[PDB]
Design an enzyme around this catalytic site. Structure first.
Site, PDB file in Angstrom:
ATOM      1  N   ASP A  35       5.357  20.328  -8.851  1.00 60.06           N
ATOM      2  CA  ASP A  35       6.135  21.382  -9.493  1.00 60.06           C
ATOM      3  C   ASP A  35       5.296  22.280 -10.417  1.00 60.06           C
ATOM      4  OD1 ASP A  35       8.173  22.943 -10.779  1.00 60.06           O
ATOM      5  OD2 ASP A  35       8.664  21.280 -12.107  1.00 60.06           O
ATOM      6  N   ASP A 220       7.501  28.952  -8.481  1.00 57.57           N
ATOM      7  CA  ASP A 220       8.053  27.656  -8.885  1.00 57.57           C
ATOM      8  C   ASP A 220       8.291  26.710  -7.716  1.00 57.57           C
ATOM      9  OD1 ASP A 220       9.248  25.573 -10.291  1.00 57.57           O
ATOM     10  OD2 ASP A 220      11.000  26.758 -10.916  1.00 57.57           O
TER      11      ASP A 220
HETATM   12  C1  LIG Z   1      18.312  17.056  -6.577  1.00 54.90           C
HETATM   13  C2  LIG Z   1      17.280  17.865  -7.318  1.00 54.90           C
HETATM   14  C3  LIG Z   1      17.242  17.819  -8.710  1.00 54.90           C
HETATM   15  C4  LIG Z   1      16.285  18.579  -9.376  1.00 54.90           C
HETATM   16  C5  LIG Z   1      15.370  19.360  -8.622  1.00 54.90           C
HETATM   17  C6  LIG Z   1      14.333  20.188  -9.290  1.00 54.90           C
HETATM   18  O1  LIG Z   1      14.592  21.376  -9.407  1.00 54.90           O
HETATM   19  N1  LIG Z   1      13.133  19.690  -9.745  1.00 54.90           N
HETATM   20  C7  LIG Z   1      12.799  18.242  -9.624  1.00 54.90           C
HETATM   21  C8  LIG Z   1      13.343  17.413 -10.820  1.00 54.90           C
HETATM   22  C9  LIG Z   1      12.782  17.850 -12.159  1.00 54.90           C
HETATM   23  C10 LIG Z   1      12.996  19.345 -12.402  1.00 54.90           C
HETATM   24  C11 LIG Z   1      11.945  20.245 -11.886  1.00 54.90           C
HETATM   25  C12 LIG Z   1      12.180  20.589 -10.393  1.00 54.90           C
HETATM   26  C13 LIG Z   1      15.472  19.358  -7.206  1.00 54.90           C
HETATM   27  N2  LIG Z   1      14.594  20.123  -6.428  1.00 54.90           N
HETATM   28  C14 LIG Z   1      13.674  19.467  -5.483  1.00 54.90           C
HETATM   29  C15 LIG Z   1      12.573  20.352  -4.945  1.00 54.90           C
HETATM   30  C16 LIG Z   1      11.395  19.914  -4.470  1.00 54.90           C
HETATM   31  C17 LIG Z   1      10.654  21.040  -4.062  1.00 54.90           C
HETATM   32  C18 LIG Z   1      11.427  22.109  -4.305  1.00 54.90           C
HETATM   33  O2  LIG Z   1      12.587  21.688  -4.836  1.00 54.90           O
HETATM   34  N3  LIG Z   1      16.422  18.609  -6.625  1.00 54.90           N
END
Ligand SMILES: Cc1ccc(C(=O)N2CCCCCC2)c(NCc2ccco2)n1
Ligand SMILES: *[C@@H]1O[C@H](CO)[C@@H](O)[C@H](O)[C@H]1NC(C)=O
EC number: 3.4.23.15
Length: 334
Positions: A35, A220
């Site tokens: 991330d 992002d």
């Molecule tokens: C169910 C869920 C919950 C949160 C996120 C999310 O936005 N993040 C991960 C957790 C911490 C916060 C920073 C980003 C997500 N996205 C997965 C993802 C992986 C690649 C692109 O999106 N899914």
């Protein structure tokens, strides 16, 4: 200074892109999201109360099973757009794409069911800068840079459109020509410290409705969708003829192919998405509803209010992140 390494990713439903890392001796494996929006490493802890069901369902780091563990124990809280994790800091050996680093990371002891019960991954590897790392903890890529092992202070993301083959790819120390084509277009960051660039307009079809006098775009990799302000997305969606649901915007599935193009004016060049790039076309029924891969997300100051270019955008545009030159390259993904 001549290693290039890769991390293989799994594509879960075009929304979650995760690879595997090992923590400790012997290596305990975790499904993690890489991330660029954040900077801390965290996985769930064996010390997480079992009343947090997310901890019942995810992999937990057991410090008691690692000989290379080093206690710190400073309490840390990581607030994201979509939820909050809480825990304490620890130190151990993390293995990522063949590369081994001594990393400080958060053992999460408090992990809310919404949203983490909905996560196919266990934790997060922050690919951002030290300036946004909670607790001024050195981020993992800085540590890998410090070993002088990589060919360059560069990492690259490929996210697959297909959700049984290669789901995605991170190259540490370069990029992979197998997954992009044509030239890279390089865009300098607003500042060092955040993977954020100047956006000079958002277009629906070819009418620049939004960011008329410029705005911010956070590149992002941890975000699923493309996001803007509540009010920004409300104007965009009115224009697409989309109906607001609680957590997303929908469109009657028949109307999906007829939706106009959406453009993003970044570094002089116009980055276009067709409806095929932003609609989940699960059907063509006029009775069925089809969801969009763009939603409202209000990021607080001083990052926000900003747009976020997540998996929706990265799928179409292979992204190189340049630490040496503080810039982002985009190239047509293949
Ligand atoms: C169910 C869920 C919950 C949160 C996120 C999310 O936005 N993040 C991960 C957790 C911490 C916060 C920073 C980003 C997500 N996205 C997965 C993802 C992986 C690649 C692109 O999106 N899914
Ligand atoms: C935790 O890390 C900080 C920063 O390096 C250090 O000052 C502190 O002594 C550590 N605490 C423990 C208990 O190891």
């Amino acid at each position: 200074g001549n290693t290039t390494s890769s991390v293989i990713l799994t594509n879960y439903m075009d929304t979650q892109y995760y690879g595997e890392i090992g923590i400790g001796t012997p290596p305990q494996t975790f499904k993690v999201v890489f991330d660029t929006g954040s900077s801390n490493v965290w996985v769930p802890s064996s010390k997480c109360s079992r009343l947090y069901t997310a901890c019942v369902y995810h992999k937990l780091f057991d410090a008691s099973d690692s000989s290379s563990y080093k206690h710190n124990g400073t309490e840390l809280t990581l607030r994201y757009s979509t939820g909050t994790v809480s825990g304490f800091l620890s130190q151990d050996i993390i293995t990522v794409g063949g590369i081994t680093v001594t990393q400080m990371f958060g053992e999460v002891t408090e992990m809310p069911a919404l949203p983490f019960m909905l996560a196919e991954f266990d934790g997060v590897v922050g690919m951002g800068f030290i300036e946004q790392a909670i607790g001024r903890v050195t981020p993992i890529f800085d540590n890998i840079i410090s070993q002088g092992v990589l060919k360059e202070d560069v990492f690259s993301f490929y996210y697959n459109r297909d959700s049984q083959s290669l789901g995605g790819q991170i190259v540490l120390g370069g990029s992979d020509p197998q997954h992009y084509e044509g030239n890279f277009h390089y865009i300098n960051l607003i500042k060092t410290g955040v993977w954020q660039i100047q956006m000079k307009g958002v277009s629906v079809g070819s009418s620049t409705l939004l960011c008329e006098d410029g705005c911010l775009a956070l590149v992002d990799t941890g975000a699923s969708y493309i996001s803007g302000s509540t009010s920004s997305i409300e104007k965009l969606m009115e224009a697409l003829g989309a109906k607001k649901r609680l957590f997303d915007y929908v469109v009657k599935c028949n109307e999906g192919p007829t939706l106009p193009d959406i453009s993003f004016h970044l570094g002089g060049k116009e980055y276009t998405l067709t409806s095929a790039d932003y609609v989940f076309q699960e059907s063509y029924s006029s009775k069925k509803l089809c969801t969009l891969a763009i939603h409202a997300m209000d990021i607080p100051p001083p990052t926000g209010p900003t747009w976020a270019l997540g998996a929706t955008f990265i799928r179409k545009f292979y992204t190189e992140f340049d630490r040496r030159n503080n810039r982002i390259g985009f190239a047509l993904a293949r």
